[PDB]
């Protein structure tokens, strides 16, 4: 399950952000559920200039 | 305040990283005092001036 595992991430960086240095701490550590892959890419430019 | 913490208790100031850790800062006293009463006669703190 990819939200029980997301889930069960967040209880372990909060559980830890004790040992944690204090810069780091202001910006927050962010957890995402995301693909490592690329799924697409899109491209947009100037058909003129 | 900050004087009193840093003398009896102890002051969290802030970090830093060895070995791969990474170590608070606490500022204790050594201490050697016969009474606390004494103890009071020996903990200076400046004025404005």
Not at chain 1, 19 to 38: E, F, H, Q
């Amino acid at each position: 399950d990819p939200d029980q595992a997301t889930i069960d991430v967040n209880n372990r960086i909060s559980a830890a952000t004790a040992k944690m240095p204090d810069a780091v701490k202001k910006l927050g550590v962010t957890v995402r559920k995301t693909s490592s892959t690329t799924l697409a890419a899109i491209s947009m430019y100037s058909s003129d200039g | 305040f900050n004087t009193m913490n840093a003398t009896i208790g102890t002051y969290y100031v802030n970090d830093f990283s060895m070995l791969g850790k990474n170590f608070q800062v606490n500022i204790r006293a050594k201490g050697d005092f016969r009474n606390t009463q004494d103890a009071l006669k020996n903990i200076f703190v400046r004025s404005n001036d």
